[PDB]
Design a protein around this ligand. Structure first.
Ligand SMILES: CC(=O)OC[C@H]1O[C@@H](OCCCOc2cccc(OCc3cc(-c4ccc(Cl)s4)on3)c2NC(=O)C2CCN(C(C)C)CC2)[C@H](OC(C)=O)[C@@H](OC(C)=O)[C@@H]1OC(C)=O
Lengths: 8, 250, 26
């Protein structure tokens, strides 16, 4: 799984 | 999904992925039913036998996706849950009766080419379309077999099965709040939902108004695409009064 | 309101590749 934006 | 096909872009724009924060992980399918409400299976959120009991802040929703693994920048939309609601008569101890939950999104999402809500059935739509032999469609990022996993959203079209055949396929006591779907052994096609597909939608397209209705929620199955076994789906219309209750109230 | 009408298909009068299989089962 590709890492998502930390903001969420 | 087992023996499905790769989805076309925008083919299921109500499909929602339920996504665990840590480990950053696919948990379940789900569906968008308005700008701030997502429908899924209760057992995606509360399932004591697996030690599953998720809180809001454990989970994200990702809407508008196609790729299982990639972060689909400028396309997908990642949303946080304000509240999880589980049907109060959800039965996890026995047969998954009333396997349904709503999720209220922190903020309403903007619709797009890839993000768009599905309809929920009215009595007449249900009575018309929910018939044995009529096909619906299931989508999800779940496993390709019992045993592995898809690069993109998978799709499969499955016929609704006569209730006595559903009942005779299993030792589980079926309720009126579920239905079953899948091809029988001597039919040419096969296909099933598999692990990671639960909570996603079983949809049908109305031949009257050309709109897509969510008639079921991927609920359970014993294995994936085993001969003589069928997938079971929460009967969405049967629980609509509960849905409308919650929504005209939060 | 416009529930269940897909931007890339029904809203453009385009069919997806297997929707016919559903409509035929009716
Ligand atoms: C009525 C009931 O309680 O059923 C429980 C049985 O459940 C039996 O085992 C499940 C066999 C096939 O299971 C999989 C074997 C491999 C993989 C499995 O899950 C992957 C999966 C599949 C799917 C879907 C496919 C199609 C869908 Cl639609 S969703 O989603 N995830 C399963 N599925 C299960 O695990 C579920 C667990 C949930 N229950 C609910 C109905 C409550 C159904 C099965 C028990 O047998 C044992 C020990 O494994 C059986 O034990 C016996 C023989 O009595 C249980 O009986 C009991 C304890 O009462």
């Amino acid at each position: 799984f590709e890492e998502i934006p930390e903001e969420y | 999904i087992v023996e499905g096909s790769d989805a076309e872009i925008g083919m299921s724009p109500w499909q929602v992925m339920l996504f665990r924060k840590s480990p950053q992980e696919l948990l379940c399918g789900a569906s968008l039913i308005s700008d701030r409400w997502v429908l899924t299976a209760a057992h995606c959120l509360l399932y004591p036998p697996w030690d599953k009991n998720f809180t809001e802040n454990d989970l994200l929703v990702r809407i508008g996706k196609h790729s299982r693994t990639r972060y689909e920048r400028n396309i997908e939309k990642i949303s946080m849950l304000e509240k999880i609601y589980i049907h109060p008569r959800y039965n996890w101890r026995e047969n998954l009766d009333r396997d349904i939950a709503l999720m209220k999104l922190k903020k309403p999402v903007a619709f797009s080419d890839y993000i768009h809500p599905v309809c929920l059935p009215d009595r007449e739509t249900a009575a018309s379309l929910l018939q044995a032999g009529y096909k619906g469609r299931v989508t999800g990022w779940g496993n390709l077999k019992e045993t592995g996993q898809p690069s993109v959203l998978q799709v499969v079209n499955l016929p609704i099965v006569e209730r006595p055949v559903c009942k005779d396929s299993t030792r589980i006591r079926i309720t009126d709040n579920m239905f079953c779907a899948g091809y029988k052994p001597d039919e040419g096609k096969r296909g099933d939902a598999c692990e990671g597909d639960s909570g996603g939608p079983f949809v049908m397209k109305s031949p009257f108004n050309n709109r897509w209705y969510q008639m079921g929620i991927v609920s359970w199955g014993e294995g994936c695409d085993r001969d003589g076994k069928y997938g079971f789906y929460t009967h969405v219309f049967r629980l609509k009064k509960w849905i409308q209750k919650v929504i005209d109230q939060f | 309101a416009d529930c269940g009408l897909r931007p890339l298909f029904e809203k453009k009068s385009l069919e997806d590749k297997t929707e016919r299989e559903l409509l035929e089962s009716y």
